[model samples]
Target: GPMGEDDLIFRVGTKGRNKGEFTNLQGVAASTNGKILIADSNNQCVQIFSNDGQFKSRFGIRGRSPGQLQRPTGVAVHPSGDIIIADYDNKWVSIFSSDGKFKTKIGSGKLMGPKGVSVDRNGHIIVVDNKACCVFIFQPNGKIVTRFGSRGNGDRQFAGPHFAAVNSNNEIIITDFHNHSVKVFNQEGEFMLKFGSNGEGNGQFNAPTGVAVDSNGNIIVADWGNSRIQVFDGSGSFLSYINTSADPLYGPQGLALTSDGHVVVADSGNHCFKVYRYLQ
Candidate 1:
């Protein structure tokens, strides 16, 4: 096989507002039912696909109403089978049923440009507020557990933070965009530690965006400006990166490990998502 080609299981979508198509693909998530959900930003919808990359269904419309979505940027599936979405322009997170029906919205009064979201081990919704430069940890019922971070490069501070990934210890891992680093926080929102710097070298990030933690605690990150995926050990040590040169990623966004343990990334600039076999 050619360099890095065989490692790519499949790539789907294109630049279009039609079903199964995407424009500015941002967040990606895998559900228990083997469904892959993508937050199609400019298209203002969440497109669903089967594990095999087959388009299943799509929901949401361009509006600011309760059930409508405006620039949906991040997505996650709750254990209760609900779909959580970070509506960027709407400044809130919307919840929908497994069948794509709108349930309710949260974080409206709290979030300022919610960019990414994830469900922690306790089913809490962790929202990364990009404009606010903070993260809000909320209960599924719309109650706030804790919120941390501020605009700056100091400790427990952030500048345009992008996504959150929870480890086995329930610690939250966040990609600090402008800071060019990743930070860890306990479930109580206490700063645990951080790593990375502004660079294209190993263990460094150039405006890191999406983040995910594998079962072994290894952190997988989408280096936005670098146009590549990097791997780091549990303690933030540099490991290696996935070979993505053949079909290079462009402005990759939120990443998620599929039910089958495949690495699926939102290739935003290319208007698609690529699934790669992530060998441990």
Candidate 2:
């Protein structure tokens, strides 16, 4: 593979908002209408922007009560336009309508430091709890179906399960942060395979923070510590790395692949978000 730099398509930031305190932007999700949603972590709010890097609106505030978020870490938009936010510090998931209207909160006692959340085809919710080192499954209506995973470096265990995404086939791909790897499991919570190691070489990841599947079923990971986005096959085979220049990435924490194949990343360290369009 070449060591040349990947072209930057565009750049935007949240520093102008919330008094420039967007210190730890943690999550990024795309809406059906081409808008992007971001979890402005330290600012205690979700920032919504247009597909072209224009600020559209912002919502939510810091609080431990209902509808408020305390160090929100992950954001996912359901097919029906509802938004699910992983309120990490609050240990709960909050749901809101597309317009940012708070609907309800879920997993008060069921989640232990929920860090990431995603929805499956059938509208089932899957959440990763870093503190518990487990994944929680819930019905769309907030009913707990089942949960699995635990702290360990073994195949069936998670060493700091940080984030997760449900693939089209319902397989769960989780970023095991502390283990420096990614694990795949079936819908029934059966471990399948694991890939990645702690390093700066190809296929290696350091504190991988986000995972997402593109339209072609390719796995895109925010390899935070390495300051690059690593692409892989659905089965964990390494493909390529994006934006590998020597420039340090503040901390690429969340990923969202747009419908047109562009990669949107929350470049947390630089206090900005970047978009990468595939070359024609």
Top-lDDT candidate index: 1
Query: How many residue-pair clashes does candidate 1 contain?
Result: 0
lDDT by residue (tens digit), candidate 1, 39-127: 98888889889989998998887898889988898899999999999998989999999889999899888888999899999999999
Instruction: Give the whole-model CA lDDT for all candidates, comma-separated.
Output: 0.91, 0.82
> For residues 124-238, what per-residue lDDT tens digits would candidate 2 score against the true structure?
8889998999998888688998888998889888888877877778888899888999988889888888899999988998889888887566788888787888889887888
Candidate 1, superposed: residue stretches over 4 Å from native: 1-6
The Cα RMSD of model 1 versus the native structure comes to 1.3
Candidate 2 Cα misplacement greater than 4 A, ranges: 1-5, 14-16, 19-21, 244-248
TM-score leader:
1
